Write a protein that binds this ligand. Structure first.
Ligand code: ATP
Ligand code: ATP
Ligand code: ATP
Ligand code: ADP
Ligand code: MG
Ligand code: MG
Ligand code: MG
Lengths: 50, 351, 48, 62, 354, 278, 192
């Protein structure tokens, strides 16, 4: 999240913002899914992605 | 004066040169060199440079315009060193200091003896020690002892504050250590001294700040070039600090830091002795009871007793008696001893 | 533009750095008076 | 080395009052030696040098 | 004479004004046979000149600053060594006036200061006939409002040696290092001006008991401070500079700071007992038109637990208070009201007493 | 013109003569991990088709880690003395010059030379100075350092899976590192140099004591029984202290008292306890 | 003292350059700041209290240097601080690993405020809501001289503020506000 925010943007959270840029579209999955598996689950911006 | 004018006339038409190193010899007249400030070039000698002496890594002088090798020169001069090589003025021998003659002799075996008579170490067949550490309360004479020791050689001794090494750039600090150990590699019987490692020493940090990383890298250069791959010869390391507890254990293991010398406060006899030391050049009377002064003397640095001798002279200046009475001694002792109501935590556990 | 360090005796003989380029011993042009060129000053100098 | 308000010899514990005279710790105060200096005038003069006469933006140029 | 005229004439021509500075890196001597040297310019370039130029090999030393020709790359001037610009700011040039008659209630401490500093600067033969040493380092500690700035600016106001100031936080720099550079440049500066006294205030800001301290802060502060200790006492001592420091709280400092030679004499400052209060009020009541019916003893005994600053402040407010009614002289009641203002009265209804 | 591939290097391998003079049998008491590493590197030059027929996939690089002075370098210092391949020793933090990308340029210079010369052994000591985990900051440094991390990984991943280039890294703290190095394909063989045991203490004592005169009235095992949690380098300090002790006695022969004083010097600083805790 | 540097010379006094404001919020301190700045006739300089805390060491002090530089350059200039609690409120040292940098910066404001060759012609106006948790060094007079507070209007300040906030608006000619303020025993001008 914005921890590496105003102080440089870290080049990564922005690409994540493009990720959410695409997920915030229209798929309904149709037949397409996206899986994810991660530790350190209490840092990311999952509030918006819920 | 006309001769001087002719001298400058001849001096006018001399142009400098570029300084660089020899990378590798491509052919008999083709060489690969690099400017000290950046890129590299392909050059040739003149006719009679004695090209055999040119080796990969040597240093040479190049023509500015023609850009060719002229006058290959010896190693370089590392300005963090000359200010710490020909800098210290003289000093009285260790006869001046006293009270710790056990340690006085003890350093002699690790430094003076193994170079003067290396035969015995070979006869028993045991390698001499490498590095020694000095620790104890401030004003135990830690710096002073090193001053007396360096006062013997005075020419083959390097001294370091261990704090002027930092800089503004990313590297530029380890490299100083490199050329230090390389000059010390140049002269064979080199003595290195570093006071107050705790600035550069540290112990470790769980990914703190980046400047911490510059520091820790600058230290790990020491850890490498102490034991590392290239062994050392006639390179003695003397370290000085106040609290050893704040240092890196990897630096504290034997091999790098061979022996840990412990300095402590003076005993009664030591206090009497140092008191006699500073008491020498003092216009006084045949009335001095050193014993009573030592009796009120409990736990005072050599600089502390020096302070006593100073203050007693202060009371002597009071009333303008050019001589010195004994009572001003005890008065100054009471004052100085009173002043130590502000110094707590003077001891530190070793390591 | 550059920055001034100090002056000398009987003459300007000014010591100046540019910013990171190099430090020089330069002099004022005739378009100026040798009064308001005190040290620690940002001053414009010819490139040539 | 001596005072002037009581002639008591001192030495290095003397004082140098504005009036050019040395005093002991008892007479160092201007009210213990009748100091003949206009502290008030050097007053009205220091404050006048340190005090910047402010000017409400008016009647500047032409 | 004609010939020397011509040669000097050419010297003027080829010795132009613009020079590129550089550093004397080292000197050598090549055989077939005189001296030689190598230089680094300000442009990060090294040059080897066999012919030195308009300078003296004995005069030059490793690590010097010189004026060199741009194109020829020849040594043409010897430059006086300069320090950091921040160092130049630390110099003192005004020389204020704070003669000792202005300060009060600190006779003893004043004696202990003039002893430790003034006499060593004046009568060295007195310290030599008995012949031991002069002290090394004076410290002022106590409550903030006791007046620590007064002795500094006053003694500098009286003496004529090179007084040099210093602030606490100034030694802290953005980039790591820069404190060792700064302090060392300062001490060398006082070296250039052998009659030299340096003052340091808020010494606690740099002096602090080290400990297992993490990523930042201390990790340059103790470096700079250690540079201060070593540059102050120990390796290569000197006698051509005297050190005065002052703080508020003493407990944060390290032992090596207050050992016995880095800071020789310790001076505490107790607040005005009675007569120091009364007399200080009598001192700032020097430039004000005073009705000559005023008891500074009454003023003192009613002024309890104040400092030199506050006692000054009451005398300040009294004049404006009388200025409220436009009166010229003052009254004891005026000082009383100023006391009330200085004391920060809270409220009313405190009437169920008595 | 095209130059020889090894011209622009700025660095040389282990020179023709700088063998550290450390016999492979010199390290007393490291039979398991010494031999294990020796097969970890040299064995995949003599036995390869077993790796294809069974499938072993010999790791490109190996990591060493342990307490500070467990012979970590004492082993790599010896392997170079008893091998023939190209060897290049590498400081941990020499590529940190204040230029822009001189770090990754130097990494290119190194790995291009390693690929160029022959089957070689690149040794990087004290990788902890670089292989952090924390993050990318921005003052003037973590750009230049972490980009050299990236250069190291880039030229670390794709050699050919066929060139005989053996990478050996080692530190004491195998914790403050990026697990990107902890990946199959980059580094697989992980080796610690833990403290010795009674037997390895006996071996080290035999090897060390075998050099000095050692008068036969000194019982070695008697000090061996004291566990004391000693590191391997401490033993050498012990025999040193005893030796210089007898020398201080003006004696060319060692006795047991020099060893009593030995543990009374090195083994000293061990006891601080408050009995009422138990 | 500024617009009339005459009386203080004719009597021989120095004005208290250091003023602190305090009291409950929403009361008339900001308003006083803007009004004084209205007739400021001076290089008035805002200062936001949190602007000084930064990521690097000493840089905030480097701010302060430029502050007192532009001050000394601009003759007869005013400085305002606001909620200076962030700067140097205490000297927490029981476990001395908390706040230190803005403590050092606060020390720089100490020195460049008073000590060693005073500033000359400068005036300092501060204001805080909790003037209770501050380092006493700022509390020393000479720096923070006067302690003006703004209270809560008993019944009539609210009346007059009805005349202030009720005047700049359109209403009928049938005004009366004493009836109002008698109805709001405890309300500020902001609530007015
Ligand atoms: N005895 C005194 N006579 C006159 N002024 C005094 C006295 N004691 C304190 N002061 C006042 O104190 C003010 C400066 O503050 P002080 O010297 O008490 O220490 P400070 O504010 O902590 O600054 P520093 O860091 O220099 O100690 C001076 O303006 C001075 O008028
Ligand atoms: N098996 C062994 N036999 C003999 N000596 C040993 C042995 N293991 C370690 N040592 C001792 O330890 C030293 C080896 O150096 P050391 O192990 O400290 O290097 P290192 O671990 O790479 O140091 P660092 O990693 O802290 O830079 C030798 O001087 C040797 O006396
Ligand atoms: N007596 C009054 N007359 C007119 N307006 C007032 C009065 N008291 C308060 N106000 C109004 O209420 C608001 C609060 O006043 P002000 O901003 O001075 O309080 P503050 O102390 O600065 O606030 P805080 O304490 O939250 O920083 C102002 O915007 C002002 O318009
Ligand atoms: N035995 C002694 N004889 C003379 N001077 C001593 C003695 N012990 C200590 N001193 C004085 O104390 C100082 C010791 O300082 P140093 O060795 O730097 O200790 P630290 O590093 O703890 O400050 C010396 O300058 C010296 O004058
Ligand atoms: Mg090693
Ligand atoms: Mg003060
Ligand atoms: Mg407000």
């Amino acid at each position: 999240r914005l921890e590496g925010g105003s102080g440089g943007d870290s080049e990564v959270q922005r690409t994540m913002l493009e990720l959410l840029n695409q997920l915030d579209g229209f798929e309904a999955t149709k037949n397409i899914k996206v899986i994810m598996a991660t530790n350190r689950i209490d840092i990311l911006d999952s509030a918006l992605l819920r | 004066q006309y001769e001087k004018s002719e001298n400058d006339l001849k001096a006018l038409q001399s142009v400098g040169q570029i300084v660089g190193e020899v990378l590798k010899q491509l052919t008999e007249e083709k060489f690969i060199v690099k400017a000290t400030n950046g890129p590299r070039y392909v050059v040739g000698c003149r006719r009679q440079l004695d090209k055999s002496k040119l080796k990969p890594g040597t240093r040479v002088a190049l023509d500015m315009t023609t850009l060719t090798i002229m006058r290959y020169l010896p190693r370089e001069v590392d300005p963090l060193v000359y200010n710490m090589s020909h800098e210290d003025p003289g000093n009285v021998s260790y006869s001046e200091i006293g009270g710790l003659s056990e340690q006085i002799r003890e350093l002699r075996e690790v430094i003076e003896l193994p170079l003067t008579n290396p035969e015995l170490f070979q006869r028993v067949g045991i390698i001499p020690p490498k590095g020694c550490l000095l620790y104890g309360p401030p004003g135990t004479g830690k710096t002073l002892l090193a001053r007396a020791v360096a006062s013997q050689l005075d020419c083959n001794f390097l001294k370091v504050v261990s704090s002027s090494i930092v800089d503004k750039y990313i590297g530029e600090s380890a490299r100083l250590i490199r050329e230090m150990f390389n000059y010390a590699r140049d002269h064979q019987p080199c003595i290195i001294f570093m006071d107050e490692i705790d600035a550069i020493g540290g112990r470790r940090f769980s990914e703190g700040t980046s400047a911490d990383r510059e520091i820790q890298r600058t230290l790990m250069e020491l850890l490498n070039q102490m034991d590392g791959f290239d062994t050392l010869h006639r390179v003695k390391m003397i370290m000085a600090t106040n609290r050893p507890d704040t240092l890196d254990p990897a630096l504290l293991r034997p091999g790098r830091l061979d022996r840990k010398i412990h300095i402590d406060l003076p005993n009664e006899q030591a206090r009497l002795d140092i008191l006699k030391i500073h008491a020498g050049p003092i216009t006084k009377h045949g009335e001095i009871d050193y014993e009573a002064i030592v009796k009120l003397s409990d736990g005072f640095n050599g600089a502390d007793l020096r302070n006593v001798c100073t203050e007693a002279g202060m009371f002597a200046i009071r009333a303008d008696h050019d001589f010195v009475v004994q009572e001003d001694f005890m008065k100054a002792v009471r004052k100085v001893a009173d002043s130590k109501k502000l110094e707590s935590k003077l001891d530190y556990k070793p390591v | 533009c550059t920055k001034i360090i100090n002056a000398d005796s009987e003459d300007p003989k000014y010591i100046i750095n540019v910013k990171q380029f190099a430090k020089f011993v330069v002099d004022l042009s005739d378009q100026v008076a040798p009064t308001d060129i005190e040290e620690g000053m940002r001053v414009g100098v010819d490139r040539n | 080395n001596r005072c002037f308000m009581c002639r008591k010899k001192v030495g290095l514990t003397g004082f140098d009052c504005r009036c050019g005279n040395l005093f002991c710790g008892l007479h160092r105060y201007s009210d213990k030696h009748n100091c003949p200096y206009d502290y008030k005038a050097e007053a009205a003069a220091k404050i006048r040098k340190e005090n910047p006469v402010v000017v409400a933006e008016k009647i500047q140029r032409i | 004479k004609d010939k020397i005229k011509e040669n000097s004439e050419k010297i003027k021509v080829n010795k132009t004004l613009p020079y590129l500075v550089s550093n004397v890196i080292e000197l050598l001597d090549v055989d077939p046979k005189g001296k030689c040297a190598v230089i680094k310019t300000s442009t990060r370039q090294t040059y080897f000149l066999p012919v030195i130029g308009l300078v003296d090999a004995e005069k030059l030393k490793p690590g010097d600053l010189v004026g060199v020709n741009k194109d020829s790359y020849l040594i043409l001037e010897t430059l006086p060594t300069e320090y950091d610009s921040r160092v130049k700011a630390m110099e003192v040039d005004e020389r204020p006036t704070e003669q000792y008659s202005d300060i009060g209630g600190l006779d003893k401490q004043i004696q202990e200061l003039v002893e430790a500093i003034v006499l060593p600067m004046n009568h060295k033969e007195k310290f030599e006939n008995l012949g031991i040493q002069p002290p090394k380092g004076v410290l002022m500690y106590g409550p903030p409002g006791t007046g620590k700035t007064l002795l500094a600016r006053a003694c500098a106001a009286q003496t004529k040696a090179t007084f040099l100031k210093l602030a606490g936080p100034q030694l802290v720099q953005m980039f790591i290092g820069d404190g060792a550079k700064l302090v060392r440049d300062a001490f060398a500066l006082a070296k250039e001006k052998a009659p030299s006294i340096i003052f340091i205030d808020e010494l606690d800001a740099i002096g602090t008991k080290r400990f297992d301290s993490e990523k930042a802060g201390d990790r340059e502060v103790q470096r700079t401070m250690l540079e201060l200790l070593n540059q102050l006492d120990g390796f290569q001592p000197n006698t051509q500079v005297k050190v005065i420091a002052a703080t508020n709280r003493v407990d944060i400092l390290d032992p090596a700071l207050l050992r016995s030679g880095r800071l020789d004499r310790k001076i505490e400052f107790p607040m005005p007992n009675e007569e120091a209060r009364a007399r200080i009020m009598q001192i700032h009541s020097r430039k004000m038109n005073v009705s000559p019916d005023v008891n500074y003893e009454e003023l003192a005994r009613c002024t309890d637990d104040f400092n030199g600053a506050q006692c000054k402040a009451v005398c300040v407010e009294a004049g404006m208070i009388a200025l409220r009614r436009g009166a010229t002289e003052l009254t004891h009641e005026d000082y009383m009201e100023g006391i009330l203002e200085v004391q920060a009265k809270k409220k009313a209804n405190l009437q169920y007493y008595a | 013109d095209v130059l020889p591939p090894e011209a622009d290097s700025s660095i040389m391998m282990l020179t023709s003569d700088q063998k550290p003079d450390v016999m492979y049998a010199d390290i007393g008491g490291m039979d398991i991990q010494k031999q294990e590493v020796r097969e970890a590197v040299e064995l995949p030059l003599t036995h390869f088709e077993l790796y294809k027929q069974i499938g072993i996939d010999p790791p490109r690089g190996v990591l060493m880690y342990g307490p500070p002075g467990c012979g970590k370098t004492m082993l790599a210092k010896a392997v170079a003395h008893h091998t023939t391949a190209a060897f290049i020793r590498v400081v941990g933090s020499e590529f940190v010059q204040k230029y822009l990308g001189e770090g990754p340029r130097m990494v290119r210079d190194v790995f291009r030379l390693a690929k160029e010369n022959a089957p070689a052994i690149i040794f990087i000591d004290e990788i902890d100075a670089i292989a952090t985990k924390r993050f990318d900051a921005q003052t003037g440094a973590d750009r230049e350092v972490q980009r050299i991390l990236l250069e190291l990984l880039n030229q670390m991943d794709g050699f050919d899976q066929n060139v005989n280039v053996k990478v050996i890294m080692a530190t004491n703290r195998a914790d403050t590192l990026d697990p990107a190095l902890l990946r199959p394909g980059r580094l697989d063989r992980k080796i610690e140099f833990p403290l010795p045991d009674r037997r390895q203490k006996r071996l080290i004592f035999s090897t060390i004591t075998s050099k000095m005169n050692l008068s036969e009235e000194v019982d070695l095992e008697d000090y061996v029984a004291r566990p004391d949690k000693i590191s391997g380098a401490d033993i050498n300090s012990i025999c040193q202290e005893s030796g210089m002790l007898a020398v201080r006695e003006n004696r060319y022969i060692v006795l047991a008292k020099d060893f009593e004083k030995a543990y009374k010097t090195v083994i000293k600083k061990d006891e601080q306890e408050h009995e009422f805790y138990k | 003292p500024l617009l009339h540097p005459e009386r203080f010379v004719n009597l021989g006094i120095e004005p208290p350059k250091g003023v602190l404001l305090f009291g409950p919020p929403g009361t008339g301190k900001t308003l006083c700041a803007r009004a004084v700045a209205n007739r400021t006739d001076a290089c008035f300089i805002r200062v936001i209290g949190s602007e000084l805390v930064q990521k690097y060491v000493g840089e905030g002090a480097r701010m302060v240097r430029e502050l007192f530089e532009m001050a000394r350059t601009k003759k007869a200039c005013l400085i305002f601080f606001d909620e200076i609690d962030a700067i140097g409120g205490a000297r927490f040292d029981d476990g001395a690993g908390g706040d230190n940098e803005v403590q050092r910066t606060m020390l720089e404001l100490i020195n460049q405020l008073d000590g060693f060759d005073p500033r000359g012609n400068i005036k300092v106006l501060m204001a805080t809501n909790r003037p209770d948790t501050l380092d006493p060094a700022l509390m020393r007079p000479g720096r923070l001289d006067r302690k003006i507070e703004f209270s809560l209007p008993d019944l009539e300040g609210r009346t007059h503020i009805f005349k202030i906030h009720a005047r700049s608006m359109s209403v009928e000619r049938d005004i009366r506000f004493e009836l109002l303020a008698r109805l709001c025993p405890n309300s500020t001008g902001a609530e007015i």
